């Protein structure tokens, strides 16, 4: 224990040894973005219960949503048409992902299972391809790497990589001490960061299987995590009403995103196409747009009538989708 | 709006038809939580109503009940208990014979868990059916090592009424009730107790929807 406390002091000493100035000194000369004025271009209304997850497709037109009425809906966001409606075998679903090929969607929740659905069947329907059962928690998040690998987080304090063809865990990512709540893949899919209910975020090597770096600094449960488009930073929302920006090469917390009129939790975070904006959905039914370099709140999204549970920016950056507990998706632009 | 776009819109409208019909069919059910503490009588109650979440269905008087058992979830409740916010009622299970058994004490843990789920901000207007289990076992084990302030008689009736009043003293809300009952793990119809309590809950919800309750 003495050696571990010495190592903690050594890591803290080196972190202070690399930390002469902060982003408020470097990004002080830069001009702001003003007010951001977005409006609801679309409203996707087909769900009959709380919406827990959504995920955009990489063509920036199709998107899944999940809700507790037991349905996955594939949406056409330009025409507001619904392309599919997938009936779920368990309605207690907390996450959903779209495959970057377009051929598959995943979902899971309190069943402890990640079910995978083929959207491209000769029979003309959507059927369950696989069901991935190795977790003992509840499925918190899942993201496809490709058509055969998916990384899942769960509330048994672990993460896992899966071979979809065999249905078996390839590697398991242990080291958190609380329920893992979110994950985000690096834009080359060789690393991912996960945030858990122990106020810390961890950088994981996908091929090897061991934690590279650990990022403490929040005060409560980390609920959301998203990667920076460069791949050398990530943002992190939590229950202490604060988003924080971290840093991979500096191994350091860079900036907090807080305000005195914000006391609720942060359900979901996302970056824009370049950086410069951090979009975060909150429990107070709203969504707040931040300036990523200057910590100035650049605008609000006053839409939904219950808490904004999920949000996502398109792959080309043309729009933002937010879903919420009042059963509606809204496209903002 | 071309030929293939009219047919995609017709397909979308057919999907919407099926979604509304599934919602009408799903609104007829009665959803219920089961939230007891460990070895408390939850398995006995789901036996009388016949790793993830377990759902048991039963039919009684042309109504369909859905009881959800979340005991296989050994995680933090604070991250999934909001999934059951619009449930109709909660069934809580307490072993009356656990007043003297230690794991601390077994029934003080039940008081802690009942106060936790009763004063939750997601179950402010959700009422509770409280089953006090192990009635005969308490009848032959029978209090002042669990409640030393009790200073009263040592008979079954008054002790059981004391535990019930001490358990219902943690409500602190006008819009909800606790419908208590005692079960000796061989009672013939505890589905009737749930049916009567759910009837009272729906009458109170409908009167509260008119400005009358």
């Amino acid at each position, epitope marked *: 224990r003495q050696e571990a406390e010495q190592l903690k002091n050594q890591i803290r000493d080196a972190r202070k040894a690399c930390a002469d100035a902060t982003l408020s000194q470097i990004t002080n000369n830069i001009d702001p973005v003003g007010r951001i004025q977005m409006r609801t271009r679309r409203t996707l209304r087909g769900h009959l219960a709380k919406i827990y997850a959504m995920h955009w497709g990489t063509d920036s*037109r*199709l998107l899944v949503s999940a809700s507790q009425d037991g349905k996955l809906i594939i949406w*056409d966001s330009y*025409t507001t*048409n619904k*392309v*599919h409606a997938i009936p779920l075998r368990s309605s207690w679903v907390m996450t959903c992902a779209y495959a970057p090929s377009g051929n598959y969607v995943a979902c899971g929740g309190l069943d402890n299972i990640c079910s995978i659905y083929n959207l491209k069947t*000769r*029979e*003309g*329907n959507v059927r369950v391809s696989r069901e991935l059962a190795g977790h003992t928690g509840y499925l918190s998040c899942c993201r496809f790497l490709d058509d055969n690998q998916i990384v899942t987080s769960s509330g048994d304090t672990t993460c896992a990589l899966w071979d979809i063809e065999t249905g078996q865990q390839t590697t398991t990512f242990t080291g958190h001490t609380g329920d893992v709540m979110s994950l985000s893949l690096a834009p080359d899919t060789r690393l991912f960061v996960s945030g858990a209910c122990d106020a810390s975020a961890k950088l994981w090597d996908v091929r090897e299987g061991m934690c590279r770096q650990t990022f403490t600094g929040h005060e409560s449960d980390i609920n959301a995590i998203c990667f920076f488009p460069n791949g050398n930073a990530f943002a992190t929302g939590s229950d202490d009403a604060t988003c924080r920006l971290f840093d991979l090469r500096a191994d350091q917390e860079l900036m907090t995103y807080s305000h005195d009129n914000i006391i609720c939790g942060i359900t979901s975070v996302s970056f824009s196409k370049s950086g410069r904006l951090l979009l975060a959905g909150y429990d107070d039914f709203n969504c707040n747009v931040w300036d990523a370099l200057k910590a100035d709140r650049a605008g609000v999204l006053a839409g939904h009538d219950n808490r904004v549970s999920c949000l996502g920016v398109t792959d080309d950056g043309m729009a933002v989708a937010t879903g919420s507990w009042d059963s509606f998706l809204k496209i903002w632009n | 709006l*071309s*030929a*293939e*776009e*009219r*047919a*995609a819109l*017709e*397909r979308s409208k*057919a999907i919407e038809k099926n979604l509304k019909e599934d919602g009408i069919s799903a609104a007829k059910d009665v959803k219920l939580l089961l939230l007891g503490a460990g070895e408390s009588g939850k398995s006995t109650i789901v036996k009388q109503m016949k790793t993830g979440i377990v759902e048991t269905h039963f039919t009684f008087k042309n109504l369909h009940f859905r009881l959800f058992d979340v005991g296989g979830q050994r995680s933090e409740r604070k991250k999934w208990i909001h999934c059951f916010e619009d449930v109709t009622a909660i069934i809580f299970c307490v072993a009356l014979s656990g007043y003297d058994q230690v794991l601390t004490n077994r029934m003080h843990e039940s008081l802690m868990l009942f106060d936790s789920i009763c004063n939750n901000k997601f179950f402010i207007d959700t009422s509770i059916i409280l089953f006090l289990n192990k009635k005969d076992l308490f009848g032959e084990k029978i209090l002042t090592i669990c409640f030393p302030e009790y200073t009263g008689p040592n008979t079954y009736e008054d002790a059981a009424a004391y535990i019930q009043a001490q358990f219902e003293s943690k409500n602190r809300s006008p819009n909800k009730e606790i419908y208590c009952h005692m079960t000796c793990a061989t009672d013939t119809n505890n589905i009737q107790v749930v049916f009567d309590a759910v009837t009272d809950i729906i009458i109170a919800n409908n009167l509260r929807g008119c400005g009358l309750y």
Partner: single-chain antibody
Amino acid sequence: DVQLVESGGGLVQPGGSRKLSCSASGFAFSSFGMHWVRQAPEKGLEWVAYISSGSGTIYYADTVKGRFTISRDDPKNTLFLQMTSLRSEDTAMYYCVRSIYYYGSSPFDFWGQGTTLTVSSDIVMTQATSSVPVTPGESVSISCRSSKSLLHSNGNTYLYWFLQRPGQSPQLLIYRMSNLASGVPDRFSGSGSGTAFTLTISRLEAEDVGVYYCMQHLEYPLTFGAGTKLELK
């Protein structure tokens, strides 16, 4: 896999009646719209009728209007074509075609085998010439000119290519002018802009031999080209 088996085609005296029946198996019949496409014994595919997925939209041709009636029974997985007043202009091989419509789908992607029946403004699609000889290994450009521009305002150009192997049903190659159907090599490719269109084969094998058809799907009625056969010089 998926099958569509037509039944009910025999000799009928002129002015009579006959009912065709297509029996489906191996897919979700109720989610697909259904088509009848006939082929006269000389040459050429042409469209007859369309019933939608929930049997709520029905279209006919002008030489079909009044006399024919399309219907489907979803628990039986069958498609019907009640035909009355059978004239000499109705002797054809009749095909039932399955077709689904959402964002990004493949209409007209599986055709049945057929039944020979015997007795006794529209967008004009042109293919010139009707027969080009190819050699096994050399490329070929098969063109198709339309009268009305098939480029819609949404960005889709609704033009489909079909290949009928000699003796078989025709099968989908290209859908919406530039895609590639499932189970088709990348030797085939589609190109064009608005009114002129081209199918290009690269490194032609001698199993691509047959007749090539271009179909418009911009407006109803659906119109085919006259055809273009390749051969074995």
